[PDB]
Amino acid sequence: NHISTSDQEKLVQPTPLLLSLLKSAGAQKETFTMKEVLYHLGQYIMAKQLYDEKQQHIVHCSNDPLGELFGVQEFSVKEHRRIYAMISRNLVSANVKESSEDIFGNV
């Protein structure tokens, strides 16, 4: 937690839908880096309990904010390629590491 000042990776902004999932998954801010995004999202499933007893790597929940987001009522977590894609397209605004000065009306 104590590094210096600039040591944060570029974080993206999840869609208002995915956002809430993070919001309830322990996320607070509106933007999050893929790691954090993929982190709260994974917890969002276990918490809501979208996984099947049979297969633990299976997530099929017809009534779920996540399902309505990805646009499917069933998906396996074995093919990260598929998920990694849909989750990436669920980002409204993308933030990058650049010089962004704040305006506090103080001069």
Phi, psi (rounded to 5 degrees) for 76: -90, 145
Question: For 40, how many CA atoms within 13 A lie in the half-sphere containing its CB?
Answer: 20
CB burial of residue 105 (10 Å; 0-12, 13-18, 19+):
exposed
Q: Which residues contact 75 (CB under 8 A, 6 or more apart)?
A: 59, 60, 82, 83
* Structure tokens that stand for 87 in this block: 């989750």
How is residue 107 annotated by DSSP? -
Within 13 Å and on the Cβ side, how many CA atoms surround 93? 7
Asked whether the beta carbons of 51 and 59 are under 8 A apart, the reply is: yes
- Give the three-class secondary structure for 40: helix
d(CA 93, CA 96): 10
Domain residue extents for the chain: 1-107
> How many CA atoms within 13 Å lie on the side-chain side of 102?
2
- Separation between Cα atoms, residue 57 and residue 64, nearest integer Å: 17
CA dihedral (26, 53, 90, 10) positive or negative = positive
C-alpha 65: how far from its chain's center? 13
Which element (helix H / strand E) includes 7? Answer: none
Say if residues 61 and 48 touch (Cβ distance below 8 Å). Answer: yes
- CB-count burial class (<10 Å; 0-12, 13-18, 19+) for 50: buried
In the DSSP assignment, the letter for residue 4 is: -
Please indicate the experimental technique that yielded this structure.
NMR
CATH topology of domain 1-107: MDM2 (1.10.245)
At 16, list the tokens: 């208002």
